[PDB]
Amino acid sequence: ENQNVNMSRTGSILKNQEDTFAAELHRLKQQPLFSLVDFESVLDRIRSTVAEHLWKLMVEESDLLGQLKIIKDFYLLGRGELFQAFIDVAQNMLK
Amino acid sequence: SLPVLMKYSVTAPMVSHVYLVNKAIVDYYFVELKMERHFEAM
């Protein structure tokens, strides 16, 4: 809701998850009793279709596979030679 | 089913039209200011 409204997880300005969610809501409401299986099997449907759309968000906006090998190369030191020249110079003036 | 969900259904149309009026005044500044030529002149 902060940055941009077409970037939503469920599909709220941009998709039509909401009408299906509303039908699920009418079905859940029509019930005077309560149990565990009927409540939690449709806790999948408010999660699983929502848990895939943001996965299909951040692939295209960022090139996911780019920075998430880059950030490991800065910390686990994949570019090994590229920091030793830093280490050689930083030794002579951290004395 | 929710008083906030139907509130959220009016909400993004009210986000959509303000951005539609905001993208007209960006074009109206483009056609009358010619600002980049004045920016280079400063």
Tab-separated table of C-alpha atoms in Angstrom, chain A residues 36-73:
chain	number	residue	atom	x	y	z
A	36	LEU	CA	-11.218	-26.797	11.991
A	37	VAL	CA	-11.017	-28.331	8.508
A	38	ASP	CA	-13.462	-25.988	6.752
A	39	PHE	CA	-11.749	-22.933	8.246
A	40	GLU	CA	-8.193	-24.027	7.399
A	41	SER	CA	-8.640	-25.583	3.939
A	42	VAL	CA	-9.642	-22.136	2.644
A	43	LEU	CA	-6.835	-20.573	4.644
A	44	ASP	CA	-4.842	-22.143	1.810
A	45	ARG	CA	-6.771	-20.186	-0.805
A	46	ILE	CA	-6.200	-16.817	0.895
A	47	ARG	CA	-2.509	-17.763	1.145
A	48	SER	CA	-1.377	-19.912	-1.797
A	49	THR	CA	-2.631	-17.824	-4.733
A	50	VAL	CA	-1.378	-14.791	-2.808
A	51	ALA	CA	1.986	-16.483	-2.129
A	52	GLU	CA	2.680	-16.976	-5.854
A	53	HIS	CA	1.777	-13.565	-7.289
A	54	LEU	CA	4.506	-11.726	-5.377
A	55	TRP	CA	6.903	-14.438	-6.531
A	56	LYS	CA	5.876	-13.453	-10.061
A	57	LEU	CA	6.360	-9.812	-9.027
A	58	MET	CA	9.973	-9.650	-7.967
A	59	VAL	CA	11.422	-11.821	-10.772
A	60	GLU	CA	10.783	-9.226	-13.486
A	61	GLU	CA	11.266	-5.933	-11.618
A	62	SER	CA	14.703	-6.795	-10.247
A	63	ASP	CA	16.288	-9.696	-12.170
A	64	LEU	CA	16.124	-11.682	-8.876
A	65	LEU	CA	18.975	-14.014	-9.830
A	66	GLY	CA	21.275	-10.994	-10.278
A	67	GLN	CA	21.731	-9.409	-6.839
A	68	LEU	CA	21.145	-12.648	-4.883
A	69	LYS	CA	24.377	-14.024	-6.265
A	70	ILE	CA	26.025	-10.595	-5.946
A	71	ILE	CA	25.276	-10.119	-2.224
A	72	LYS	CA	26.700	-13.572	-1.469
A	73	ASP	CA	29.860	-12.726	-3.416
